[PDB]
Design a protein around this motif. Structure first.
Motif, short mmCIF file in Angstrom:
data_model
loop_
_atom_site.label_atom_id
_atom_site.label_comp_id
_atom_site.label_asym_id
_atom_site.label_seq_id
_atom_site.Cartn_x
_atom_site.Cartn_y
_atom_site.Cartn_z
N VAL A 1 20.58 -0.61 53.56
CA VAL A 1 19.29 -1.22 53.89
C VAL A 1 19.02 -1.13 55.39
O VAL A 1 17.95 -0.67 55.81
N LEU A 2 20.01 -1.47 56.20
CA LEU A 2 19.84 -1.38 57.65
C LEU A 2 19.51 0.05 58.04
O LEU A 2 18.50 0.31 58.70
N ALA A 3 20.38 0.99 57.68
CA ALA A 3 20.23 2.34 58.19
C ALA A 3 18.96 2.97 57.65
O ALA A 3 18.21 3.62 58.40
N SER A 4 18.68 2.79 56.36
CA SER A 4 17.48 3.37 55.78
C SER A 4 16.23 2.82 56.43
O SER A 4 15.27 3.55 56.66
N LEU A 5 16.23 1.53 56.79
CA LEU A 5 15.00 0.99 57.34
C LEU A 5 14.83 1.33 58.81
O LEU A 5 13.71 1.54 59.26
N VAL A 6 15.93 1.43 59.55
CA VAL A 6 15.85 1.92 60.92
C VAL A 6 15.30 3.34 60.92
O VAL A 6 14.35 3.66 61.65
N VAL A 7 15.86 4.20 60.07
CA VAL A 7 15.38 5.58 59.96
C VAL A 7 13.92 5.60 59.52
O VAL A 7 13.10 6.34 60.08
N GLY A 8 13.58 4.84 58.48
CA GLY A 8 12.22 4.86 57.98
C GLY A 8 11.22 4.41 59.03
O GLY A 8 10.23 5.10 59.29
N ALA A 9 11.49 3.27 59.67
CA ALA A 9 10.55 2.79 60.67
C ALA A 9 10.50 3.70 61.88
O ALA A 9 9.48 3.72 62.59
N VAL B 1 17.14 -8.72 58.41
CA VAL B 1 17.64 -7.38 58.68
C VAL B 1 16.50 -6.38 58.60
O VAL B 1 16.42 -5.44 59.40
N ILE B 2 15.61 -6.55 57.62
CA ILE B 2 14.39 -5.74 57.54
C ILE B 2 13.62 -5.83 58.85
O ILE B 2 13.20 -4.81 59.42
N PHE B 3 13.42 -7.05 59.34
CA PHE B 3 12.67 -7.22 60.58
C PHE B 3 13.32 -6.50 61.74
O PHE B 3 12.67 -5.73 62.46
N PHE B 4 14.63 -6.72 61.94
CA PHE B 4 15.30 -6.08 63.07
C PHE B 4 15.30 -4.57 62.92
O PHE B 4 15.11 -3.85 63.91
#
Ligand SMILES: CCCCCCCC/C=C/CCCCCCCC(=O)OC[C@H](O)CO
Ligand SMILES: CCCCCCCC/C=C/CCCCCCCC(=O)OC[C@H](O)CO
Ligand SMILES: CCCCCCCC/C=C/CCCCCCCC(=O)OC[C@H](O)CO
Ligand SMILES: CCCCCCCC/C=C\CCCCCCCC(=O)O
Ligand SMILES: CCCCCCCC/C=C\CCCCCCCC(=O)O
Ligand SMILES: CCCCCCCC/C=C\CCCCCCCC(=O)O
Ligand SMILES: CCCCCCCC/C=C\CCCCCCCC(=O)O
Ligand SMILES: CCCCCCCC/C=C\CCCCCCCC(=O)O
Ligand SMILES: CCCCCCCC/C=C\CCCCCCCC(=O)O
Lengths: 406, 406, 406
Positions: A51-59, A132-135
């Motif tokens: 979730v962390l890595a995918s959302l950092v990459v996505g954003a 975690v989504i937010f960060f």
């Protein structure tokens, strides 16, 4: 390999019912259940890294404007679908006339502030998805701003950080694939234990409750999700075929969050959704999707009300369900959730829950099939999450159409 | 610089005994002990970074097949050595005839599931070694699979992640080296405090207990480890010379996990073991090595049994020790461990531990030398861990032979 | 954009006083306060990432020798300024003659050991600043040692790790800048709530207490910091102009640690301090700065002593304040701190704090303005931290002079 999980489900459910009906569910608890617990843990392991890595990459991959639009689109979707879930809960609950047996008879502001983590390392260690989504989103955005800056040192640092997150996400998706080689055994073990313990208990009035509840879920799927997909030009049968692994995993694990690595791999490999969409929408929907809650509360509240002979008008049922839904928002998918929320709802209206009372009795009866109800609740929620993710991706032109064509 | 730690140990132990014998151990507690506590903390700081990074790197460096073989080889080793430890515990306990004073007179399934972390960030923050081992191995494996994939973006992300872990591991090993410039002072302070507080208490029957226990450890070293090394063609005297820093650190710190950064630096610099072997075997052995437990339980159980005059046959002692060992598996090296496990064993057999009872008295007597027993327990465990690591590395052709030749 | 925060402060304080004076502070609590809480959380989010990454980068950028010199210089500075704070506390407390109303009337060793983290991941997850400082420094040092080693693999791993930390720090500073676009609203909301709740309570004797306390802070600023800056050749008016955003944020947030991302961005963008200095000095000073504590204890202790008519000589007040300061060292800036420490001080001298007693009453009176006192305490502490950081940077030739010239 394909379709093996659905065989796992059916065979497990049959074995569970037979074992329970013949007395042996205790042995099942000892010998069978650990394989499913192992499946669940293996998937849980991946939630925070992926979730962390995918959302950092996505954003990073997506512009702030588009990210805002994805946010508002997916929220509107979840509002629509929860409204429908309330409707179908009231309708199907009343149609089955659950509970024909006879007895005697606002803090949301801090939840929003709590969206912002005060220590993102703490939120990672505690497994808090929404902060975690937010960060991850803010980190991704900041990273792309730095990667457009002129100074090369800044660009290279940002790229290294983004590659670390990309590598972690990739490793997680690979591990998910490996675990999915194992998935049929886990699915078998879980459904077997549940059927052996509580399946035998679905009979008489409670069977009509289970039927009623499952009918509601069925409708939410075949009406709300199918119509929404068709309106936007997605084949719903292809959708279901692609969703099947996520749907079954959601069913057996009874956790929206615990299925996330599988739901995200399905969105990538099968649905063809860009990481910029699903890395954000799916973890958010896992915590904000309120369809299963509305359905559970509508049906079980009606069953309880009828069991104690307390008169409940349709409008009064609606207001009760809505206040329960408002109290539930933000809570991710967790086993034994709706039973606790129902207990809270009963307490807040002033009913006597002391031992021996009629309401304590009806509650215990629901509690004993609660697992059977939770399986369906989680499966319909993960289904709706995938549907809304696909829809939003389409409206944003981030959906790969080649995946949807035989 | 070389051999300075062993001088630290001997001088500290002498100072401690003298200070305690003359009354001044209280002043020691105030003034001397903090330097050793500092040594212990400095080593603890490195455990999670060095274990994570070293095992990610190691599992990347090695094939899954070879990793499986290393796992099975090292487990077989730890079974062999724990069997020997049980034997020597029974033998030496009976030979010394400990306790000639006179008074009146299964949950392992969840432990295995718990091997899999549900939140690897949580396991890192909580310092849970075995789940960190699991995640690092799976991450390393996944990383190497990605680095063999055709797409270069995936390869570059995986390489960046692996380099981050490699850099962290390297930094940890460097810091270990620096701390080992400090090690003699810490060793002095720790052994000094222990000798001043509990050394003076080793006299009369308890001296024979301590002697008996230490004899058992000695045998486990000079028989089991030496013979095993010779069978596989390692010079045991060279081995001891190379192990000396790890052995003394284990002795004084009383923690298998807290010595890990030192044990791993010794395995790298001195033993010449590849990271693919020791980055896995050593952290695992720190939590699964049962030699010291078998020895402690055998001796202290016999001492207690004789103190209260309860007849105990050799077979009954064996079954008791074995059930204590089964209850102990998975627990890493921690101070005050065996005393608690002994208390559990006494409770489970139905003995009266209420204040004033004979068994509470014998237990308190053991408890008062427990630190003296723990030092030896930890030193023999870390010794056996290094021995088994070296052996497995040899059988896998991952041992550098140039290090073993004068 | 510039100066907008100071308008936020003044307007918020006026609105708060008016709202409180007219009864409506309860509505403020509901409607206004959340925007300031949001500001505080957004800044808190950044503390651990920016502190870790900035200090890893800084300690890499600087030699161990120079880092030691920076440490000793900044500690000497904080000792000087705390001595002055004690002086001004005693003086201003006695000048205002606080409390003319009438009623009836060592564990530091373990704190030092606790500087060393036993699990740096745990200290990150728990938000423990000082052990994170330690680990970041040692990691930075180790990293630079590895980057000077001959083997290129080691160099490349160290550079990747250092770039990951550099990217994280950079992203944090960018996010800080974005949040500082928002800062005026947050400052308004916080000062508004505080004024509405406790401003109205500053009247009569307590106004002289607040005045007295704020006078002490004022002096600590305009005398100690200005003279120290001038001695070393920094324009104090330019300093204040550059510090203004950090000063106001410290004032409203009442947390030295929570202002750190802002204080560090001010030190970088405005003051022009190298990361090698401020990434170390500022987080350390946030936890060791004792000026506000000395001032708070001096004034409130005198007020309490006079309220109960207990005679207190200047030397006795000094010894009491000094022992309170020794007990306080190491605690970072946190709301409601000095009130608790004062309560401890009162308890330790044997006074009767049971309900109804005079001392419980005087304490409750202080407690009710405690927020008003904390704002000033935090603002003077963050001011002194920036002053000492700038000074040390100058003595180390790490201060960019172009920033200080119109
Ligand atoms: C859950 C409901 C949705 C929550 C919120 C959306 C999803 C997450 C955030 C996305 C970026 C939103 C802010 C950035 C995009 C806004 C427009 C933009 O590009 O910049 C804004 C700037 O302040 C002036 O232009
Ligand atoms: C503690 C006792 C030992 C625990 C376990 C061993 C140590 C850790 C795991 C190693 C890799 C094991 C799995 C991978 C290697 C097996 C063979 C292989 O290469 O692939 C397997 C695949 O499923 C078909 O080939
Ligand atoms: C808070 C008070 C200050 C705390 C301490 C200072 C700040 C943090 C550490 C800096 C490096 C200190 C050690 C490294 C520098 C010392 C000289 C050096 O370069 O090497 C030392 C070596 O042991 C022989 O030369
Ligand atoms: C499809 C998978 C089947 C399992 C999930 C379905 C709903 C709960 C089981 C249905 C009730 C079983 C029959 C009751 C009984 O045997 O008396
Ligand atoms: C009942 C499970 C719901 C999903 C399957 C039925 C609806 C979609 C379909 O017909 O394939
Ligand atoms: C070798 C290091 C020595 C310390 C560890 C050895 C075992 C415990 C100490 C031996 C008992 C000391 C003698 C008892 C006494 O002085 O009365
Ligand atoms: C007693 C300590 C055990 C280690 C040293 C003795 C055995 C090996 C050796 O003789 O060097
Ligand atoms: C400058 C910002 C102003 C707020 C902080 C200053 C000190 C506390 C407020 C001063 C007391 C207010 C007057 C008391 C009253 O109105 O009766
Ligand atoms: C009172 C707030 C303290 C800071 C401002 C006053 C002193 C410095 C100045 O005059 O600008």
């Amino acid at each position: 390999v394909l379709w093996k999980i659905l065989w796992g489900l059916v065979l497990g459910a049959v074995f569970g019912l037979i074992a329970g009906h013949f007395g042996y569910a205790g042995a099942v608890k000892t010998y069978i259940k650990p394989f499913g617990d192992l499946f669940v843990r293996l998937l849980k392991m991946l939630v925070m890294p992926i979730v962390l890595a995918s959302l950092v990459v996505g954003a990073a991959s997506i512009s702030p404007a588009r990210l805002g639009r994805v946010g508002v689109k997916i929220v509107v979707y979840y509002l629509a679908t929860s409204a429908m879930a309330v409707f179908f809960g009231l309708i199907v609950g009343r149609l089955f006339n659950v509970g024909a047996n006879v007895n005697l008879g606002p803090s949301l502001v801090q939840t929003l502030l709590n969206i912002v983590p005060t220590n993102p390392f703490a939120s990672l260690a505690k497994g808090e998805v929404l902060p975690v989504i937010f960060f991850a989103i803010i980190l991704g955005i900041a990273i792309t701003y730095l990667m457009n800056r002129n100074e090369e040192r800044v660009r290279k640092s940002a790229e290294t950080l983004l590659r670390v997150f990309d590598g972690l996400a990739e490793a997680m998706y690979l591990i998910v694939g490996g675990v999915m080689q194992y998935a049929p055994i886990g699915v078998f073990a879980l459904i077997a234990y549940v059927m052996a313990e509580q399946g035998v208990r679905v009979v008489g009035p409670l069977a009509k409750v289970v039927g009623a509840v499952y009918t509601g879920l069925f409708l939410q799927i075949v009406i709300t999700y199918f119509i929404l997909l068709k309106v936007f030009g997605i084949d719903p049968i292809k959708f279901i075929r692609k969703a099947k692994d996520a749907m079954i995993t959601a069913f057996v694990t009874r956790s929206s969050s615990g299925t996330l690595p599988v739901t995200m791999r399905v969105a990538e490999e099968e649905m063809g959704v860009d990481k910029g969409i699903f890395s954000f929408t799916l973890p958010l929907g896992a915590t904000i999707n309120m369809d299963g809650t509305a359905l559970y509360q509508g049906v079980t509240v009606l069953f309880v009300a009828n069991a104690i002979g307390h008169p409940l008008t349709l409008g009064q049922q609606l207001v009760v369900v809505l206040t329960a839904v408002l109290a539930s928002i933000g809570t991710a998918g967790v086993p034994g959730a709706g039973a606790i929320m129902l207990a809270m709802v009963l307490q807040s209206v002033g009913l006597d829950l002391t031992p021996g009372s009629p309401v304590a009795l009806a509650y215990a009866m629901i509690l004993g099939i609660d697992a059977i109800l939770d399986m369906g609740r989680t499966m319909v929620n993960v289904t709706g999450d995938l549907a809304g993710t696909v829809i939003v991706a389409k409206t944003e032109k981030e959906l790969d159409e080649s995946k949807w064509i035989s």
